[PDB]
UniProtKB/TrEMBL annotation, chains A, E, F:
Full-length numbering of the shown residues: 19 to 337 of 564
SS bonds (residue pairs): 43-273, 56-68, 91-135, 277-301
Family of the protein in this entry: Belongs to the influenza viruses hemagglutinin family.
UniProt superkingdom: Viruses
Name this polypeptide is given: Hemagglutinin
Main subcellular location: host cell
Organism for this UniProt entry: Influenza A virus
Length: 320, 168, 171, 171, 320, 320
């Protein structure tokens, strides 16, 4: 007998998919919409390399720890790779104030350029560029490159005027010298107590030393409290101090990439590659909507889901 | 209805006729291409419609920010639960619909042929038509093509079905 | 001149309907109850997608200084994550509901066709284009009985069998 | 008494079934394997909607002072954003799955009907109400052959052809 | 021959919808569920108008700047329109402490009424109502309306008790006078160093003047740190001071609308209309579930999506 | 005649469901996927009981307020029930610094064990274990159990070394005595002004008394500022002071359950029950994906939704 039939394809595909009704239904074609592969590298984001601090911390680098003289001169970065146990941090012992906000503020910047803020040689009745064995450079007592330790004022005020004539903010770092006792306070700054006042228009901050013997470290019972600030565009900072001020000599003009920074804690080094999405485990080169590589991500990334696979059926039910 | 055909390749849905010439399979390429275009467009939709913000994840911190860290970690899990649950169900639903979509395509291919040979065939009840007449490679073809002429085989079919019963 | 598998420009009066051809003339006629049933359902679906959104009172702040950076970073993250969720889901929701709404209309006109089919049976010939060629005479009173689900099969059985025999023979 | 356009109060033993009428009597019988296939599929659907939620360990705090007001604002924003997302998505999910579940049961009784139809063919008359008027004699052994998809067409062909000619007028 | 056909409607609608399977499918009907329009107004939120601090800042207004005496007497507000470049702020140079939290605290209030906190005339051994050229009122040296500059205590402690008997919190504002040198400190308050202590039960805050020469602004080398606080219902505050206190003379009872305030930065003016959803670009008069006008919203609003349209099909396939 | 029919089941079920297309459709069977029941109890989380600070606050208990000596010795807890106005808090009037972070840090811990930090009898030239009437233990003047009030140093410095040799952090609490006047300062510590310096490596904090008369509470015009700290594993803290130090005598080794704590404000007492999900109204014993009991939740819980029911149709359309 003559006989015509209607039917559909079946092949040798072992792909199975799950549906709301049945599980592990064999199909002739299935698509994976979950990205599960990365390149195992720390890359540049869209061509912009991250900031590699190497043996230094952000603080050590910005302050200008002599051992950080080799980094160097990075103009822009898409994110920062943090080296946790970086040895080159604060060479002179002390506290860093508000480090976390500085981290956020520096997480992604554009036109980063160092600037000389004032000329110490213009100053009179004072000693400038003071050094210490604790901040050595090649077997000699040095100090932070971007800071200036001022002494010998004999209890008299000295003044520093800082100006930001650009349309970008100006990053400033400085310190307050916490003397160990009155005898050191008098010998260095010629008084028993000092004030240091930062003037941003009508706004002002006053700094006072916290005098007292700290437990000895690096032959120092005294400390330095390190501060940072941001002098806005077209603005002026005026400083007056009767001592204890480690002056800001070098600052940095910078433009921060709005809502486009990043802080990366990773053991991987930095490679010569680029990506639009980065994880601590490596970069994702994906056009897929979902990924299960890592939740902590930077850039334009697929959404992180708690799944091992997302098999989307395309083909037919494969039952011969 | 009994299952798919191993060795029906070159098309998703199609025909497998069987006359006095011989046997063989064939693919309905237009009906296949429609389905192939659509399923592709579904997959593209699920992929391309995802537009992502530039996101920056921070979870490295300390102990002097414990309130913000707690909220940040709470937001992370909540985002995790949403995207996990929703995507899982998106896949399950769409896999069920995709399979329903296939069954409908061959079934309309079936009903389009059945509509061409009304009386001129017996429905075997398994996607196969027992033709009540002789059908060569011009007849089986025109059925596939959508041009089968029901009248050019009417009387011969009636004779055959009469030979399937009595008479008075 | 008859669909489906093609739309009737000038059906009017409803979404789904009939077109007849006999001795008295032609004419379209919408199936009002089947049309009204579908309208209610589609209206219900639209209202569900709209009325089930009862969003809370919330206020957004992005105007802010620097020194809380950490909070503003988190806040911007939440803003952007909320946006990605609502954007993606709503895109798919619309794409899905449109695929299903078109399927819904299809199933409605097919059932309409099936209802007529189950009435006429072998008293008619399935032209396979959404039309039934009646094997007997169907005046306007007969066409109405079909559209109302009151067409009686046996009242036209002999005439249809006789006409089918004419398509063959012979006595 | 003859439905598919209506539900059988007193079907029991299953979701989808048959009701026969012959010389020996009447009675309902559920199609167990088709019922069990739907019971499995529905069970899987309910389980999917339920078991696929695996929520993390999470703790919520709203008891808090003033001076972190900023943080409490964001935390409340997040809570409410999350609330709107889960409320709206779950409502729509439940509305959608209910519509499809109902369509799932319809398709099942419809395929059961189409299976019976493909066996009987012209040996029976589609009454259009999910019933088949058999054109021959069908004892309980015949009924069980139909319910088991084993009904043989030719074994009743002649008797049916005779019965239909009677219907088509013999004078 | 007699025929009857089954068919569907076709019309002249140019509307097209996208589906999961096809794109740009013509239809006979389609609904837009995305709000794309705003009225371009700053409206009231459910009949409650926003707060317009026109030329004054919130601080300037609450402190009682002599140029902010016209605003005025707004009992309630649903959100605050922020004028970032308002000229009338701090007429006496200094810092405002914790401004952001105050902005939040005052974002939406109900029963905002001013109260006299204490009567300066009842005090002895002291000068009250001290004025200054920097806070002029009509060509004459004045001072903040709601603050009282106390001097001449001659090193002796003075006391102020402030009681909040009501069932609502009480907003207080005050200042601390940062003298320029020991001479001015000795001269105004009869000592070298004062203390000012605020008492809320066992809880206390001690303020000390930060003495030192600020950069000269408005002929002042001294400054004032401004503080705000909130005295809970049925609570008593007790202050003792030996100088440098700019006393809180006028405060404000207020009830905050819980989880229902707002801060708005917009160049639009405040119109005489009402809405349930407010954006910086204008108000959303929408019953639709989604909008694409603005992300920064206040009120009960449609969800912000990144989309140009959301056409929901309602009609049939329009292929005749 | 002889006819066979195809049909479906109908029953006496009064359950309805809503669909995208129709509402209140009667069905033969439906499932609720919304949990709406709770047991009205505060319970343990997976067997781990919460922390019951009965008449005490967390501050009172950790400092060792004599009225908290009964609690006691809880090694672990899954979350903390904050008490509705606990009477036993700070027996000696003063301020607790950074309480909220301490609430967070302690919201869930594992190996909570007390340690003696130093031995007061080993100290010389000083008076230890001082008591006051404001911290009574059964009608007798006593003091905090975990702090040591040191006096009589005659202006001379004294030293304390705290070592944490374990692999878990060590919780430390101490206080700074804010004396009421210079006379009391001299009489107790033999100077006009003291320093207390905490050393953690190069990092240091310097504490100074805020001398001044506070309002008289519990016969005290002086106060104490209470502080807390976490000394990390394998670390050492060194303290030097010339007065005003309320020394840390007993600390707590603890291991925090990461991202798995909780703070519970409820009027319900603690019951002898267990659960995996806890609300302020009661425990949720559910496997269901959603709940409408409470938004504030702790543990592995169904998502909160703003819905009264979520009926999932399982059965057939029930039209007989
Ligand atoms: C078939 O499945 C196995 C599972 O072990 C897998 O390794 C293999 O790649 C699959 N091959 C096909 C047919 O895709
Ligand atoms: C430096 O800043 C300018 C601003 O005009 C910008 O155009 C340029 O892209 C920046 N440099 C880099 C390396 O992007
Ligand atoms: C202030 O709040 C009180 C609440 O008791 C209310 O009675 C009164 O109407 C409010 N004032 C105005 C004028 O709205
Ligand atoms: C922590 O607690 C458990 C008891 O729950 C105890 O058995 C274990 O030894 C403790 N861990 C340490 C630090 O020994």
């Amino acid at each position: 007998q003559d006989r015509i039939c209607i039917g559909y394809q079946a092949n040798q595909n072992n792909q199975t998919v799950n549906t709301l009704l049945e599980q592990n239904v064999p199909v002739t074609g299935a698509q994976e919409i979950l990205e599960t592969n990365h390149n195992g590298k720390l890359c540049s984001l869209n061509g912009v390399p991250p900031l590699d601090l190497q043996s230094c911390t952000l603080a050590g680098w910005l302050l200008g720890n002599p051992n950080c003289d080799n980094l160097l001169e990075a103009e822009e970065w898409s994110y920062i790779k943090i080296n946790e146990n970086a040895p080159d941090d604060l060479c002179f012992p002390g506290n860093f104030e508000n480090l976390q906000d500085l981290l956020l503020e520096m997480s992604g910047v554009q036109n980063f350029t160092k600037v000389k803020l004032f000329n110490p040689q213009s100053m009179t009745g004072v000693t400038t560029n003071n050094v210490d064995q604790t901040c050595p450079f090649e077997g000699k007592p040095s100090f932070y490159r971007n800071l200036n330790w001022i002494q010998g004022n004999s209890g008299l005020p000295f003044n520093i005027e800082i100006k930001n004539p650009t349309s970008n903010p100006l990053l400033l770092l400085w310190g307050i010298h916490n003397t160990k006792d009155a005898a050191q306070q008098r010998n260095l700054y010629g008084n028993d107590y000092s004030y240091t006042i930062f003037n941003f228009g009508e706004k002002s901050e006053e700094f006072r030393p916290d005098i007292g013997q700290r437990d000895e470290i690096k032959a120092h019972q005294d400390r330095i409290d390190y501060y940072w600030g941001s002098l806005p565009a077209q603005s002026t900072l005026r400083i007056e101090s009767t001592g204890n001020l480690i002056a800001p000599e070098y600052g940095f003009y910078y433009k921060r990439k709005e809502g486009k920074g990043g802080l990366m804690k990773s053991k991987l080094p930095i490679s010569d590659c680029s990506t639009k999405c980065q994880t601590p485990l490596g970069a994702l080169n994906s056009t897929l909507p979902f990924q299960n590589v890592h939740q902590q991500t930077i850039g334009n990334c697929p959404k992180y889901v708690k799944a091992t696979s997302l098999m989307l059926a395309t083909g037919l039910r494969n039952n011969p | 209805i009994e299952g798919g055909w191993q060795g029906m390749i070159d098309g998703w849905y199609g025909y497998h006729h069987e006359n006095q010439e011989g046997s063989g399979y064939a693919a309905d390429k237009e009906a296949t291409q429609k389905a192939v275009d659509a399923i592709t467009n579904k997959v593209n939709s699920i992929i391309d419609k995802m537009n992502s913000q530039f996101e920056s994840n921070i979870k490295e911190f300390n102990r002097l920010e414990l309130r913000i860290q707690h909220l940040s970690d709470r937001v992370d899990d909540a985002l995790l639960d949403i995207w996990s649950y929703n995507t899982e169900l998106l896949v399950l639903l769409e896999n069920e619909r995709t399979l329903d979509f296939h069954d409908a395509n061959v079934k309309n291919l079936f009903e389009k042929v059945k509509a061409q040979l009304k009386d001129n065939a017996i429905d075997e009840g398994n996607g196969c038509f027992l033709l009540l007449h002789k059908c060569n490679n011009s007849c089986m073809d025109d059925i596939k093509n959508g041009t089968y002429k029901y009248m050019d085989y009417r009387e011969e079919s009636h004779i055959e079905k009469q030979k399937i019963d009595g008479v008075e």
